[PDB]
Amino acid sequence: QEGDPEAGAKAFNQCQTCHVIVDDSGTTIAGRNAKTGPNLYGVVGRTAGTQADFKGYGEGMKEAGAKGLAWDEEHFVQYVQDPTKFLKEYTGDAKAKGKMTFKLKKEADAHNIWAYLQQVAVRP
Amino acid sequence: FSTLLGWFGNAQLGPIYLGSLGVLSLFSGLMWFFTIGIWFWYQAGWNPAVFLRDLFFFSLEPPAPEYGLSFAAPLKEGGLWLIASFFMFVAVWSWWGRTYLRAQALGMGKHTAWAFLSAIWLWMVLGFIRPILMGSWSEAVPYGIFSHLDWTNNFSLVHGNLFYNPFHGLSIAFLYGSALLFAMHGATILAVSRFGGERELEQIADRGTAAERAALFWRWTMGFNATMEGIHRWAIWMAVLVTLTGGIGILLSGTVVDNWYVWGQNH
Amino acid sequence: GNFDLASLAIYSFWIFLAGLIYYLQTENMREGYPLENEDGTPAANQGPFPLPKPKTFILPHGRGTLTVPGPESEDRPIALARTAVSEGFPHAPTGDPMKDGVGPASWVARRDLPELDGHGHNKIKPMKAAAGFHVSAGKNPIGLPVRGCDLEIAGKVVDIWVDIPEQMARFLEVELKDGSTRLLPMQMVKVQSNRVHVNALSSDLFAGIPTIKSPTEVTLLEEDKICGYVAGGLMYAAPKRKSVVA
Amino acid sequence: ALLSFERKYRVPGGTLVGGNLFDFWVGPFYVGFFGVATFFFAALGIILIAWSAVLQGTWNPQLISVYPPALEYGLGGAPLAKGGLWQIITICATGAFVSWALREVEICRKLGIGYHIPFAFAFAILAYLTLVLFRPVMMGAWGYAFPYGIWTHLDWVSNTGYTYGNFHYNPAHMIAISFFFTNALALALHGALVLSAANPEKGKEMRTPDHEDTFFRDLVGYSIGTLGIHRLGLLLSLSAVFFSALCMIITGTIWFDQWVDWWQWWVKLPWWANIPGGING
Ligand code: BCL
Ligand code: BCL
Numbered sequence: 001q002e003g004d005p006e007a008g009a010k011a012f013n014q015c016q017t018c019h020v021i022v023d024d025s026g027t028t029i030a031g032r033n034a035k036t037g038p039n040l041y042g043v044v045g046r047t048a049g050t051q052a053d054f055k056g057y058g059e060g061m062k063e064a065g066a067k068g069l070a071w072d073e074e075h076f077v078q079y080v081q082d083p084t085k086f087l088k089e090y091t092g093d094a095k096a097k098g099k100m101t102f103k104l105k106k107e108a109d110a111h112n113i114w115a116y117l118q119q120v121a122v123r124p
Numbered sequence: 125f126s127t128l129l130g131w132f133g134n135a136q137l138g139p140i141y142l143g144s145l146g147v148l149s150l151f152s153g154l155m156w157f158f159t160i161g162i163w164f165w166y167q168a169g170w171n172p173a174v175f176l177r178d179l180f181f182f183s184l185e186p187p188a189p190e191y192g193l194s195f196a197a198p199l200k201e202g203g204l205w206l207i208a209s210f211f212m213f214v215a216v217w218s219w220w221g222r223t224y225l226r227a228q229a230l231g232m233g234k235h236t237a238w239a240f241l242s243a244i245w246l247w248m249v250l251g252f253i254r255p256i257l258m259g260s261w262s263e264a265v266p267y268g269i270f271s272h273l274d275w276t277n278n279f280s281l282v283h284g285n286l287f288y289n290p291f292h293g294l295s296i297a298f299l300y301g302s303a304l305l306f307a308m309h310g311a312t313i314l315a316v317s318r319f320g321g322e323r324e325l326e327q328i329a330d331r332g333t334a335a336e337r338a339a340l341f342w343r344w345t346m347g348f349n350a351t352m353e354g355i356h357r358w359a360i361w362m363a364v365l366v367t368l369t370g371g372i373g374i375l376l377s378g379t380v381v382d383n384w385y386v387w388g389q390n391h
Numbered sequence: 392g393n394f395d396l397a398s399l400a401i402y403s404f405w406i407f408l409a410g411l412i413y414y415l416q417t418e419n420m421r422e423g424y425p426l427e428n429e430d431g432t433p434a435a436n437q438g439p440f441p442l443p444k445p446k447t448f449i450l451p452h453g454r455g456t457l458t459v460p461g462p463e464s465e466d467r468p469i470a471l472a473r474t475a476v477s478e479g480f481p482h483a484p485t486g487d488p489m490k491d492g493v494g495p496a497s498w499v500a501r502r503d504l505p506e507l508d509g510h511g512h513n514k515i516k517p518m519k520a521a522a523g524f525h526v527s528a529g530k531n532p533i534g535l536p537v538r539g540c541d542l543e544i545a546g547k548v549v550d551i552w553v554d555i556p557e558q559m560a561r562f563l564e565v566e567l568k569d570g571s572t573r574l575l576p577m578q579m580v581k582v583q584s585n586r587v588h589v590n591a592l593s594s595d596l597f598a599g600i601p602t603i604k605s606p607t608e609v610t611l612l613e614e615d616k617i618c619g620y621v622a623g624g625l626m627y628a629a630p631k632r633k634s635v636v637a
Numbered sequence: 638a639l640l641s642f643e644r645k646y647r648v649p650g651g652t653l654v655g656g657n658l659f660d661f662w663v664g665p666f667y668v669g670f671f672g673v674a675t676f677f678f679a680a681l682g683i684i685l686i687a688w689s690a691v692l693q694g695t696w697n698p699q700l701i702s703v704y705p706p707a708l709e710y711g712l713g714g715a716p717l718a719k720g721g722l723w724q725i726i727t728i729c730a731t732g733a734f735v736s737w738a739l740r741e742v743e744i745c746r747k748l749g750i751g752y753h754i755p756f757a758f759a760f761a762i763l764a765y766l767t768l769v770l771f772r773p774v775m776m777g778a779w780g781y782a783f784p785y786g787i788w789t790h791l792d793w794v795s796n797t798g799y800t801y802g803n804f805h806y807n808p809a810h811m812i813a814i815s816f817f818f819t820n821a822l823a824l825a826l827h828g829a830l831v832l833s834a835a836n837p838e839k840g841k842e843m844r845t846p847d848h849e850d851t852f853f854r855d856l857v858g859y860s861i862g863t864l865g866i867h868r869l870g871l872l873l874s875l876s877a878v879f880f881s882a883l884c885m886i887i888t889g890t891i892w893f894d895q896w897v898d899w900w901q902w903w904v905k906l907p908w909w910a911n912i913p914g915g916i917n918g
């Protein structure tokens with residue numbers, strides 16, 4: 001309840017056009033070797049825009065993490081509904097920009113994915 | 125009576141008759157333009173300066189997913205959208221009807237009406253059928269320059285990369301073909317225009333050296349060829365087949381298929 | 392139990408396309424088929440696609456009908472002989488190709504009548520007989536001389552023939568040295584500020600150009616006769632073409 | 638194996654090289670000096686691709702992909718199994734294409750027709766060469782071109798696109814597409830008009846080029862004529878492809894940020910960039 005992982009998994013699929021989940025070993029937990037976006041493995045509890053491999057973070061994403069953002073359910077759900085907006089509010093800057101050209105419409109979808117994220121992408 | 129219809133029937137814009145529908149078409153058309161327009165200004169804050177700088181950013185979004193398929197949605201949150209659409213609907217269909225009757229009137233084949241019909245299939249699917257089958261107007265395309273481009277992108281991402289949609293590809297194949305084919309026929313015709321080739325209809329009924337050289341150009345180049353007439357039977361299907369296949373692919377999205385990449389890996 | 396709607400659709404669609412292809416192709420076999428050998432006799436191996444069922448065109452203005460596919464018209468001696476006994480080789484002209492009308496200088500046995508517009512009047516008329524057509528196109532070609540690819544002059548522009556309907560010049564009536572006059576396909580002549588260049592034909596072949604019985608109207612057959620001759624010059628009037636062409 | 642009127646046309650001459658040496662036919666097709674050439678390149682590339690099929694380990698035409706020389710390789714060479722092949726193939730292709738085009742030129746000559754055909758075709762080639770030569774050359778690496786794979790080339794498009802956000806925002810890209818759609822429309826309309834004039838209501842004479850212009854006008858409001866409609870299709874089509882090559886030649890060579898940011902210039906004009914309200918304020 002409050003986040004069905006097996007449901008979030010099917011959802012995350014659509015994320016696979018830009019994201020991928022790979023552990024520190026180099027094994028794929030989910031993805032098609034898409035590098036358009038950052039590796040979501042370990043995104044949970046991670047500071048916004050600090051994934052070592054990803055070299056395409058926006059100014060907003062970097063500045064928003066440096067201000068103290070560490071993806072938790074609350075903020076995660078606000079991000080996937082409208083990145084740019086989210087990054088503007090949380091950043092406090094009205095001219096902030098996000099590079100994630102995608103918007104997850106269903107608020108439920110988010111909560112389901114986050115759960116899936118908790119079940120498969122949490123670096124111990 | 126008929127007197128009124130006879131009056132309208134002669135409506136014109138110079139040497140062209142607008143017909144009855146033609147009036148309903150244009151009228152309904154402006155109402156559509158008017159609907160979106162007013163809204164944009166409301167969003168611009170009635171300030172002309174702001175209007176002109178954010179003209180491509182304004183968007184008359186459809187109702188929210190919560191409003192399902194009802195027309196209860198308030199004006200500033202879905203109403204105007206429906207109204208606008210209502211006009212674009214009457215606008216378009218009127219025009220289709222006009223194109224038909226005007227062909228009948230000149231006593232010609234109803235090809236143009238049919239061709240145009242294919243383009244309407246795609247339009248029809250995107251903003252009407254699919255939303256109805258999906259259960260809400262929120263699945264509809266918004267009115268706005270940048271906004272609908274944003275739609276498209278998202279729509280694809282959401283449904284697992286349309287690239288992997290057989291119907292998306294099939295469509296694109298025809299979109300390219302259309303360029304190709306017209307690029308050919310166009311150049312070809314010109315290539316033999318010295319033999320009075322642009323005059324196709326007469327070449328249809330009375331073959332000329334032009335309709336031979338062309339037919340022979342390609343037969344020697346690619347092995348086969350068309351006829352002064354038939355080439356156009358290609359041209360037409362080559363084009364109509366874009367929105368056709370096209371339409372189909374969009375309809376199957378969300379309703380039948382959720383993610384095309386996956387559906388692709390199984391087939 | 393159920394079925395995958397999408398894949399059934401995609402499947403169906405292909406069945407459809409093939410059928411359309413077949414349809415299209417066969418439909419495009421009304422002109423030119425059956426296929427003959429270099430001999431003049433049926434090839435028997437017409438291909439996978441069969442000829443379509445005949446259809447009749449009711450021509451306007453009372454010109455008659457046309458049923459296709461039908462008996463092959465082509466009625467005029469082909470002044471060309473084989474070059475080898477192996478199929479697939481050219482057929483060189485026996486005499487004068489430019490005159491005998493072959494290769495790039497061929498013409499079709501089209502109806503011997505002028506093309507008529509929507510009302511029933513000729514489509515092409517000599518401007519000096521038009522219903523109010525002035526020369527506002529730019530430069531007046533009427534008067535200036537007319538030379539050949541050999542740079543030698545062969546006559547002057549006497550009148551411009553206009554395509555009343557589409558409203559565009561289509562022919563140039565240039566009087567020759569022997570009083571008579573000829574017609575030139577606009578596309579085959581460049582209009583310069585001081586003269587007219589006919590890079591297609593030689594100053595001597597300006598006579599071989601077929602004539603138009605009526606001095607005020609050219610029939611379709613006559614156009615095919617002309618144009619084909621002119622265009623064919625490019626290939627055959629090359630031995631007499633003066634280099635540095637611009 | 639000839640049309641009932643092909644004869645009088647199959648005369649000798651028209652070639653550009655070799656003269657009467659290769660001036661003959663193979664059934665319906667004409668050979669010419671460039672016919673053997675096109676076949677040469679064609680076949681060579683066909684082979685090299687199949688070789689890559691073997692090296693890769695599959696004959697499934699839906700997996701066989703020929704990837705170019707890894708970025709690092711720059712503009713130099715590379716092992717046949719590591720980009721080399723893609724390069725040579727890309728050579729046979731360029732060649733086979735340029736040949737296929739010149740061959741057309743010979744046929745245009747023999748028939749005494751125009752040269753518009755190959756002329757146009759050249760555009761497709763420029764477009765091609767733009768993706769596999771010019772762009773990579775300007776960007777400094779072959780790795781920037783696309784793989785030669787049925788599906789693996791779509792992914793290239795996908796990726797390459799999102800490499801700049803929603804590609805849509807590319808001004809040039811917008812125009813091109815615009816041209817592509819219009820061409821389709823234009824082509825549809827064209828055919829439809831002739832077929833409807835050639836195949837009128839049962840029992841009627843064919844229509845006149847005037848019924849044709851009176852109809853087309855009652856739709857657009859203007860009359861472009863026959864020579865005009867065709868000159869417009871060729872125009873519309875060529876443009877699309879042109880604005881496409883332009884569309885890419887600038888992506889990564891002069892523009893690097895997400896195309897959506899490019900439009901800020903319009904918004905940031907002094908006389909309104911700072912006005913409160915609207916969407917961007
Ligand atoms: C800038 C545009 C992109 C691009 C974007 C897309 C997109 C987007 C799609 C395709 C799709 C296709 N692309 Mg592509 N494609 C590009 C460049 C190419 C080139 C090339 C040498 O440049 C080729 C041969 C192809 C070929 C193809 C076809 C396999 C396929 C559909 C046919 C079509 O649209 O025909 C238009 C032309 C005709 C209909 C005329 C007949 C041409 C025939 C059909 C082409 C035969 C191609 C053949 C299979 C490969 C030949 C290999 C040799 C035998 C060795 N693309 C460039 C890089 N392409 C579609 C698909 O299904 O992809 C999976 C698709 O959706
Ligand atoms: C990230 C985005 C996705 C993507 C998502 C989508 C989606 C989503 C769709 C397409 C569709 C299409 N895609 Mg795609 N597409 C992608 C990449 C590509 C690429 C490429 C090389 O990258 C190519 C070549 C294409 C090509 C195509 C076309 C074949 C097809 C649209 C046909 C069309 O234009 O109808 C144009 C004609 C109409 C829409 C007819 C309606 C017009 C009505 C009848 C008249 C209006 C009159 C009006 C009132 C007057 C107003 C005037 C104007 C204001 C000026 N796509 C990427 C991968 N694509 C569409 C499709 O399949 O459609 C079936 C579609 O829905």
Ligand code: BCL
Binds near residue numbers: 767798803804814878
């Ligand atoms: C997520 C992906 C991005 C995107 C990323 C890209 C990228 C990246 C590119 C394009 C390109 C194009 N995009 Mg886009 N594009 C997107 C969405 C769209 C949409 C839409 C509905 O939204 C549309 C309509 C388009 C449309 C287009 C076309 C205008 C353009 C293709 C050029 C072309 O057709 O060359 C057609 C002609 C050729 C490529 C010539 C090559 C053909 C050769 C000469 C002949 C082949 C002969 C053959 C081998 C022999 C066959 C065998 C025989 C049959 C036996 N894109 C989305 C937003 N797009 C491309 C572009 O600009 O290209 C210049 C490009 O690179």
Ligand SMILES: CC[C@H]1c2cc3[nH]c4c(c3C)C(=O)[C@H](C(=O)OC)c4c3nc(cc4[nH]c(cc(n2)[C@@H]1C)c(C(C)=O)c4C)[C@@H](C)[C@@H]3CCC(=O)OC/C=C(\C)CCC[C@@H](C)CCC[C@@H](C)CCCC(C)C
Binds near residue numbers: 679683759785
């Ligand atoms: C304004 C440009 C438009 C255009 C025009 C155009 N195309 C043309 C012409 C013209 C004017 C011709 O005269 C010529 C023709 O003969 O008509 C059918 C042609 C043609 N356009 C073709 C295809 C084509 N055109 C396309 C596009 C376009 N053509 C544009 C829209 C497309 C696309 C990308 O949508 C394709 C696939 C050919 C069918 C034909 C030219 C035939 C030809 O060049 O043959 C040469 C040799 C071979 C058959 C062998 C090729 C084998 C290898 C050498 C290469 C292949 C390897 C690799 C490069 C390809 C791998 C593909 C992967 C991406 C999957």
Ligand code: HEM
Binds near residue numbers: 016
């Ligand atoms: C699918 C619904 C989806 C999810 C979920 C998702 C999440 C996500 C997160 C949590 C981040 C931040 C990561 C971090 O700080 O380490 C993030 C960032 C980006 N995304 Fe994403 N994303 C989903 C889908 C997509 C899709 C479909 C795309 C490509 C169109 C995409 C892209 C990006 C990009 C780019 C970033 C980095 C953004 C920046 O630095 O501003 N995502 N995503």
Ligand SMILES: CCCCCCCCCCCC[N+](C)(C)[O-]
Binds near residue numbers: 251
């Ligand atoms: C005065 C503003 C004019 C804006 C016109 C906006 C056109 C955008 C059309 C895309 C939406 C299409 N539709 C029917 C599918 O919703």
Ligand SMILES: CCCCCCCCCCCC[N+](C)(C)[O-]
Binds near residue numbers: 289293297361
């Ligand atoms: C009427 C013209 C004939 C056009 C034939 C074009 C066939 C192209 C097929 C592309 C293959 C598409 N896909 C994804 C479905 O496999």
Ligand SMILES: [Cl-]
Binds near residue numbers: 836
């Ligand atoms: Cl019919």
Ligand SMILES: [Fe+2]
Binds near residue numbers: 309313324356827867
């Ligand atoms: Fe035509």
